[PDB]
Amino acid sequence: YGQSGGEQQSYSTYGNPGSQGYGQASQSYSGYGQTTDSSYGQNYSGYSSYGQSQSGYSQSYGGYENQKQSSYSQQPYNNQGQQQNMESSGSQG
Amino acid sequence: YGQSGGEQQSYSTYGNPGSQGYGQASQSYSGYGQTTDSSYGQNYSGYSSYGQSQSGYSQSYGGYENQKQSSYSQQPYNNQGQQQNMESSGSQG
Amino acid sequence: YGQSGGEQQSYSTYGNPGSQGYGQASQSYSGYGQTTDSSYGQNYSGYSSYGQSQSGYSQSYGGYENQKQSSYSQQPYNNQGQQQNMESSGSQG
Amino acid sequence: YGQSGGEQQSYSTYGNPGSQGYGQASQSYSGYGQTTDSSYGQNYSGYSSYGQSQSGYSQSYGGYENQKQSSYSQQPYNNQGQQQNMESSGSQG
Amino acid sequence: YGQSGGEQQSYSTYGNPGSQGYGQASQSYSGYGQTTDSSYGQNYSGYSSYGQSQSGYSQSYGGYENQKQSSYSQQPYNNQGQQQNMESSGSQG
């Protein structure tokens, strides 16, 4: 068995991800068929090439700017980061 | 058995990830078929090439700027980081 | 058995990761089939090449700047780092 | 058995990681099939090449700058680092 | 048995890691199949080559600068480091 308290998870991405998977992907083979000279796939996100395919994938991006001041800025304030606060959330027999 | 308190997890990325997987990927073979001269795949994120495929994947990015001042800045304040605060969250028999 | 208090985990990346996996990937073979002259894969993130594939993956990035002042800055303040604070979170029989 | 207090973990990376794995990867073989002249893989992040594949992976990056002043800076203040503070978090019978 | 107080762990990297693993990787063989003229792998991060693959991985980076002033700086202040503070966190019978 196992007993755990509450759970907080936080994810932040500042940038261009090529692909993102968040959910559940399942691929199961419980049968007893024949796969011969073949290929099969599950592509949840991103890029899969199989069979006798001929393909190409290009992703091109310009620049990325985050919390940026161009010339002649007067006392800019830029704040970022992660803060975790936990109280009274230990374990007790 | 196992007993744990609360849990906080925080993730931050400042930049361009080629691929991100966050969720659950499962691939199971419980059957008893034949795989002969074949290939199969689960691609959750990112890039998979199999079968007799001929493929290519290019990702190209410009620059990245974070908490940046161009010329002639007067007393800019740039703050980042991680702070963890925990109180009264130990274990007790 | 095992008893633990609260848990805080914090991750920060300032830069371009080629691939990131955050979640759960499981690959199981509980069956009793034949795999002959074959290949199979689970690709959670990043790059997998198998079968008889011919492929290529290129990632190209420009520069990276973090907490940066161009010329003629007057008393810039740049702060980063990690701070952990723990109180009254030990163990007690 | 084992009893522990609270736990704080903090990770920071200033730079371009080729691949990052954060979560759980499991690969299990509990069956009794035959793998002959074959290969199989789990790729959680990063790069796996097997089967009869022919592949290549290139990652190219420009420069990296962190807490940087270009020419003619007046009394810049750059601060980074790690600080751990612990109070009253020992063990007691 | 074992009793421990609170635990703080802090990791910082200023530079480009080729690969990073943070989480749990498990590879188990509890079955009783035959692996003949074969290879299999778990790649959590970084680079694995097996099977009859032909592959290459290149990572190329420019320079790295941290807490740097270009020419003509007036009284720059650069601070980094690690500080650990512990009070009243010993053991007691």
Residue numbers in the entry:
A (entry chain I), B (entry chain G), C (entry chain A), D (entry chain E), E (entry chain C): 7 to 99
Text from the published report:
In healthy cells, FET proteins are mainly localized in the nucleus and undergo nucleocytoplasmic shuttling. FET proteins have roles in transcription and in the splicing, processing and transport of RNA. Surprisingly, we found abundant amyloid filaments of the FUS homologue TATA-binding protein-associated factor 15 (TAF15, also known as TATA-binding protein-associated factor 2N) rather than of FUS itself. The formation of TAF15 amyloid filaments with a characteristic fold in FTLD establishes TAF15 proteinopathy in neurodegenerative disease.
We used cryo-EM to image amyloid filaments in the insoluble extracts from each individual. TMEM106B filaments were not observed in individual 1. Contrary to our initial expectation, the filaments are formed from TAF15 and not FUS. The TAF15 filaments comprise a single protofilament with a left-handed helical twist, with the ordered filament fold formed by residues 7–99 of TAF15, which are part of its LCD. Perpendicular to the helical axis, the shape of the filament fold somewhat resembles a scooter, with the proximal N and C termini representing the two handlebars. The filament fold contains 13 β-strands of between two and eight residues in length, which encompass 57% of all residues. These β-strands, together with their counterparts in adjacent TAF15 molecules, form parallel, in-register β-sheets characteristic of amyloid filaments. The side-chains of the four acidic residues in the fold face the solvent and one of these, E71, forms a salt bridge with the only basic residue, K74. Consistent with a protein fold stabilized by intricate hydrogen-bonding networks, the high-resolution map shows that the TAF15 filament fold is well hydrated. We modelled 23 ordered water molecules per TAF15 molecule, each contributing between two and four hydrogen bonds with either polar amino acid side-chains, the backbone or other ordered solvent molecules.
